[PDB]
Nucleic acid binder design. Structure first.
Length: 276
DNA sequence: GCTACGATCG
DNA sequence: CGATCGGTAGC
């Protein structure tokens, strides 16, 4: 019932210092989160890149403070075609991106504004807000179709440069990845299809659970807690947000934090330092 | 008031 | 189990 995120370890196993900080956050309503003092934290965090999930907001409405964000001058956004005030992702960065694509190159899955790929120098970044299988699992059957595709797309990317996948990947991979593993085997985020698909994901590319790789033992590390009950004040949550990065990035991997004390939404931000 | 983002205790 | 009372942000 504890979990206290450890200190920020800013060095690789090789030896050299950090040279890239990536923060990702499922803000649960961009606007609201903003009023909730989110940018103060952002400005306070100083990530070189900031991926945001569930922005649930279209560009011709984006809060003004955004542009006013200093070291994040390059802002890219994505929203659902027919879904007003739904899904939506946003990638922000200090250094400008060589190439920036939206979605995973697939019609039916791209129509919800859930993916953004930012190509860089030493690596590539994708930020995603994975399709919730919904309550009663009304969408689990479809979900798996996304996954089938998603891993397919990501693999072809990990063929040129080191890939960095982050966002609400919407899955409690292992039982260690949620406070109550047993009591949720028949609730979204923990289905054996989702979990399997996720594992299948790791192997296929392949990719690595940055955090898990740093704390294989460390339990109670949740990045999401439902608003229901006093969930957060009781740390009874799930860890649905990850930093999956190609194998080649592991000798450069510094840390993977779960900034729990960061208040703003049902999810907490997650930062990835890279000694690139 | 509803709709898409699950811990409780029968 | 599995029914459900039930915190949000946004239409």
């Amino acid at each position: 019932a504890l979990y206290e995120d450890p200190p920020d370890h800013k060095t690789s196993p090789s030896g050299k210092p950090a040279t890239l900080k990536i923060c990702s956050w499922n803000v649960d309503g961009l606007r609201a989160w903003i009023k909730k003092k989110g940018l103060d934290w952002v400005k306070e965090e100083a990530p070189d890149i900031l991926c945001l999930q569930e922005t649930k907001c279209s560009e011709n409405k984006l809060p003004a403070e955004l542009q006013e964000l200093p070291g994040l001058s390059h802002q890219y956004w994505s929203a659902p075609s027919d879904k007003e005030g739904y899904s939506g992702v946003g990638l922000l960065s200090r250094q400008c991106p060589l190439k920036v694509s939206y979605g995973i190159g697939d019609e039916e899955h791209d129509q919800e504004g859930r993916v953004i790929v930012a190509e860089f120098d030493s690596f590539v970044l994708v930020t995603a807000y994975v399709p919730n299988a919904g309550r009663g699992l009304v969408r689990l059957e479809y979900r798996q179709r996304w996954d089938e595709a998603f891993r397919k797309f990501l693999k072809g990317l990990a063929s040129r440069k080191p890939l960095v996948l982050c966002g609400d990947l919407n899955v409690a991979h292992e039982e260690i990845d949620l406070r109550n593993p047993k009591g949720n085997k028949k609730n979204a985020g923990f289905t054996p299809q989702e979990r399997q698909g996720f594992g299948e994901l790791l192997q296929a590319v392949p990719l690595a659970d940055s955090f898990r790789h740093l704390y294989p033992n460390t339990p109670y590390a949740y990045t999401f807690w439902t608003y229901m009950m006093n969930a957060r004040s009781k740390n009874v949550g799930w860890r649905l947000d990850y930093f999956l990065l190609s194998h080649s990035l592991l000798p450069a991997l510094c840390d993977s934090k779960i900034r729990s004390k960061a208040l703003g939404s049902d999810h907490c931000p997650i930062t990835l330092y890279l000694a690139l």
